[PDB]
Amino acid sequence: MFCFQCQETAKNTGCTVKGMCGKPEETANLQDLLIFVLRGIAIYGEKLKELGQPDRSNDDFVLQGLFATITNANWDDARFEAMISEGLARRDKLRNAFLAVYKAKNGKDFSEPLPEAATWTGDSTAFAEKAKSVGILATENEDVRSLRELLIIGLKGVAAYAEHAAVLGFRKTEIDEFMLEALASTTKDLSVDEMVALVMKAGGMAVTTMALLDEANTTTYGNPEITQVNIGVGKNPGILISGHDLKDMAELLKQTEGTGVDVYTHGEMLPANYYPAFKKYPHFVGNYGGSWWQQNPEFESFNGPILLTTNCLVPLKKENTYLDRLYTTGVVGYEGAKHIADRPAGGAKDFSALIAQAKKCPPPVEIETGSIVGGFAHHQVLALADKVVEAVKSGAIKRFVVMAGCDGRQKSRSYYTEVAENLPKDTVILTAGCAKYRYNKLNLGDIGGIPRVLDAGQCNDSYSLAVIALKLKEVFGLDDINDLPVSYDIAWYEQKAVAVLLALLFLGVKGIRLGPTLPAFLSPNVAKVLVENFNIKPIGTVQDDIAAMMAGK
Numbered sequence: 001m002f003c004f005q006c007q008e009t010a011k012n013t014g015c016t017v018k019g020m021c022g023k024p025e026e027t028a029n030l031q032d033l034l035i036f037v038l039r040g041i042a043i044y045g046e047k048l049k050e051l052g053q054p055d056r057s058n059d060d061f062v063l064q065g066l067f068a069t070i071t072n073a074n075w076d077d078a079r080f081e082a083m084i085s086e087g088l089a090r091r092d093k094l095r096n097a098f099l100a101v102y103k104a105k106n107g108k109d110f111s112e113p114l115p116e117a118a119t120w121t122g123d124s125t126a127f128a129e130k131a132k133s134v135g136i137l138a139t140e141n142e143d144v145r146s147l148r149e150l151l152i153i154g155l156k157g158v159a160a161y162a163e164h165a166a167v168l169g170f171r172k173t174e175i176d177e178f179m180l181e182a183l184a185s186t187t188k189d190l191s192v193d194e195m196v197a198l199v200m201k202a203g204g205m206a207v208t209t210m211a212l213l214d215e216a217n218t219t220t221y222g223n224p225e226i227t228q229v230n231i232g233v234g235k236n237p238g239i240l241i242s243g244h245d246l247k248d249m250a251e252l253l254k255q256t257e258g259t260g261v262d263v264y265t266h267g268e269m270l271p272a273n274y275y276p277a278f279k280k281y282p283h284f285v286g287n288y289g290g291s292w293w294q295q296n297p298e299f300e301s302f303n304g305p306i307l308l309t310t311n312c313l314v315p316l317k318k319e320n321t322y323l324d325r326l327y328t329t330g331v332v333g334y335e336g337a338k339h340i341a342d343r344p345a346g347g348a349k350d351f352s353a354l355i356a357q358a359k360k361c362p363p364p365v366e367i368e369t370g371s372i373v374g375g376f377a378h379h380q381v382l383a384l385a386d387k388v389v390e391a392v393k394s395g396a397i398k399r400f401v402v403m404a405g406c407d408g409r410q411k412s413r414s415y416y417t418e419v420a421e422n423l424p425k426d427t428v429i430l431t432a433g434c435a436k437y438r439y440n441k442l443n444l445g446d447i448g449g450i451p452r453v454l455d456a457g458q459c460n461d462s463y464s465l466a467v468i469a470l471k472l473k474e475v476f477g478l479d480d481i482n483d484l485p486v487s488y489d490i491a492w493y494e495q496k497a498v499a500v501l502l503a504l505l506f507l508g509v510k511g512i513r514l515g516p517t518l519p520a521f522l523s524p525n526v527a528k529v530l531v532e533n534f535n536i537k538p539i540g541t542v543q544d545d546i547a548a549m550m551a552g553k
C-alpha cells in the first residue's frame with residue numbers, strides 16, 4: 001500500500017505495509033480507488049461547467065467520498081466498495097450527459113484522449129486489483145506527486161468542513177465547483193506554477209468554507225460563549241457523542257430529552273458545550289475523557305453507547321468490549337458497528353436504538369473530576385476586545401501563542417504540553433481543535449480575568465482565531481497581520497489541519513511552526529517554496545522555541 005496523508009505516517013515517509021493508524025492494505029487501496037473514481041467524476045463535471053451546463057447532482061457524494069478517506073474516518077471496506085460502485089454509475093451519467101452536450105455544441109462526437117479515471121470500469125470483484133495501480137505511487141515525479149497530493153489532502157479537509165455546512169443547509173457553488181477543478185487537475189500535466197496556484201486557491205477555498213461552517217454553526221446554534229464544562233460524571237446511563245457534527249448533537253439532545261439517558265461529549269464535540277442552543281438541556285452533563293487517541297480505554301469505561309459523527313474513530317483493541325454499543329453515522333464506518341443512516345431531506349436521524357441500549361448500561365466510570373473553560377470564539381472574544389486590548393497595552397498580556405490544531409499519539413507531542421507549562425505567565429494561549437487536549441487541563445489561571453487558555457472550539461473554529469487576528473490588526477493600525485504580538489505553534493495530524501494551515505497561508509500568516517514533524521508529502525523543492533514564501537518552520541526545543549516566539553521569531 002502507500003499512504004502518507006497524516007502526521008503519523010511511518011518513518012515520516014509513508015505507510016507501505018499497514019498504516020500506523022491501523023488501516024490495512026485492502027482498505028488503503030480501496031480509498032485510492034475511490035479517489036480515482038472521484039477524479040473521473042470531476043473530469044466530466046468540470047467539462048459540463050465549461051460548456052455552460054453545470055451538473056451539481058454529485059456535490060454531496062463528492063464531499064462525502066473525500067471525507068470518508070480522511071484519517072480515522074471509515075474502516076468498512078464494504079462502504080468503500082459501495083461508494084466506488086455508486087461513483088462509477090454517477091460518473092457514467094455525467095459522461096453520457098457530456099457526450100450529448102459536446103456533440104450539440106461542436107457538431108461531432110467527442111474523441112479527445114481522456115485519463116483512465118474517466119473511462120475505466122469493473123464490478124466489485126475487479127476493485128482490489130485495480131486499486132493497486134491507481135494510488136499515489138502512479139505519479140513518479142516527486143514535485144508533481146507532492147503538489148497533487150498536497151492539493152488533494154487540503155481538499156479533503158475543505159470537503160469535511162463543507163459537508164458539515166451542507167448538513168446545516170449552507171452551500172456555495174464555488175466550493176463544489178472547486179472540488180471538481182482540483183480533482184480533475186490531478187489528471188493533467190500542469191506547470192509547477194499552475195500546481196502551486198491550485199494549492200493556494202485551495203487555501204482560499206478553505207477560508208470560504210471555514211467561514212461558511214462558522215456561519216452555519218453559529219446561525220443554527222448561537223455564538224459560543226464562556227462556559228464551564230464538567231468533566232466529572234453523573235449517575236445516569238449516558239450516550240457519548242464524538243467527532244464534530246453539531247446537527248447530530250442537536251438531534252441526539254432532542255431525542256434523549258426526558259428519557260433518563262444523559263448526553264456527554266467527547267473529543268471534538270467538547271465545543272458543543274459552548275453553544276447556547278445546547279446549554280439549555282439539563283441532561284447534557286459535560287465532556288468525558290481526553291483526546292481522540294485515548295479513546296480505547298475511555299470508550300470502554302464510559303459504559304454507555306458511543307456515537308462517532310466523524311473521525312477520529314480508532315480500531316478497537318482486542319480486549320475492548322464496546323463494539324456492541326459502538327454506533328457510526330455520517331461518513332464513519334466500522335465493521336461490526338451499527339450505522340445510523342443519513343437523515344432524509346427535512347427529516348432527522350433516528351437514535352432510538354442508542355437510547356434503548358443506554359438504559360441497559362451502567363453509568364460512566366469517573367476517570368477525572370473538575371472542569372474545562374471554553375467558548376472564546378470570535379463573537380465572544382470581540383465582545384471582550386476592549387479588555388483584551390487594554391491588557392495588551394498595559395503589558396498584562398505580552399503575547400498570544402496560537403496552539404490550535406490536531407493532536408496525536410506520538411511521544412514527541414509532550415512538546416506542546418511543555419510549551420504551555422513553560423510559557424511566561426503574561427502570555428495567553430489561543431486554541432481550537434483537539435490539539436487543546438495537550439494543555440486544557442492544566443492550572444494556568446487567568447490574567448485580569450482573561451483565562452490563559454482561550455478555547456475557540458473545534459479545529460474549524462481556527463476560523464475564529466483568524467477573525468480575531470484580523471480584528472486586532474485593524475485595532476492596532478498595522479499594515480501586516482504578522483506584526484501583531486502573536487506567535488503560531490500549530491500541531492497537525494490529519495487533512496482538516498492541513499486545510500487550516502492552507503487557509504492561514506492564504507491569509508498571509510508567515511513564520512508558523514508546524515509539528516511535531518513536517519508532512520511527508522512535501523518534496524524538497526515544495527518544502528523550499530513554502531519556506532521561501534511563508535517561512536514555515538519545524539519545532540525545536542521547548543526552551544528554544546519559547547525564547548524565539550517571545551522575540552517575535
Ligand code: SF4
Pocket residue numbers: 003004005006007008009010014015018019020021022023028070071072
Ligand atoms: S492515514 Fe496516516 S497512519 Fe494511516 S495509513 Fe495514511 S499516513 Fe499512515
